[PDB]
């Protein structure tokens, strides 16, 4: 917890074409999240347990 | 604060050869930090105002 962590997680989907990369936060966070990195390099915390996250991820991985 | 943030920041220097990338957290954090990404993809929060951070960074940028 000398590692970057997500207090909360984006309500609704961000636009799929704003998004270029993802990673998962440490599991040592209290809300471990997925993080989306936008073409503009904003890092956005998302709720991994949510359908739009899991098809965005599937989308970035089956490019 | 739907963006990944650093509660605290690594006391002492990490080994320079463990470190492959860096970025700065959002300025919207309460402790906005530098984050070091290790060859093993651990993200480590560091205090930007600290001499070892600023020559690690200079090191990754003058490669």
Author numbering:
A (entry chain A), B (entry chain A): 6 to 68
Q: What's the paper's own text on this?
A:
The CCL5 variant, CCL5-12AAA14 with two Ala substitutions at residues F12 and Y14, resulted in the formation of a less aggregated mutant. Therefore, we were able to crystalize the sulfate-stabilized CCL5-12AAA14. The crystals belong to the trigonal space group P3121 with unit-cell parameters a = b = 48.3 Å and c = 60.4 Å and a solvent content of 54%. The structure of CCL5-12AAA14 monomer was refined to 2.55 Å. The structure of the CCL5-12AAA14 monomer matched the generalized view of a typical chemokine tertiary structure, consisting of an extended N-terminal portion (N–P20), a short 310 helix (R21–H23), a triple-stranded antiparallel β-sheet (β1: I24–F28, β2: V39–T43, and β3: N46–A51) and a C-terminal α-helix (α1: K56–E66). Notably, although one CCL5-12AAA14 molecule existed in one asymmetric unit, it packed as a dimer with two-fold symmetry. In the interface of the CCL5-12AAA14 dimer, backbone hydrogen bonds were formed between C10 (chain A) and C10′ (chain B), T7 and C50′, and T8 and Q48′. There is a one-residue shifting in the N-terminal backbone pairing region, which changes the relative orientation of the two monomers. The overall length and size of the CCL5-12AAA14 dimer becomes shorter and more compact, while the distance becomes closer between the two α1 elements. The native CCL5 cannot adopt the CCL5-12AAA14 dimer configuration because the sidechains of F12 and F12′ are too close to pack together in the structure.
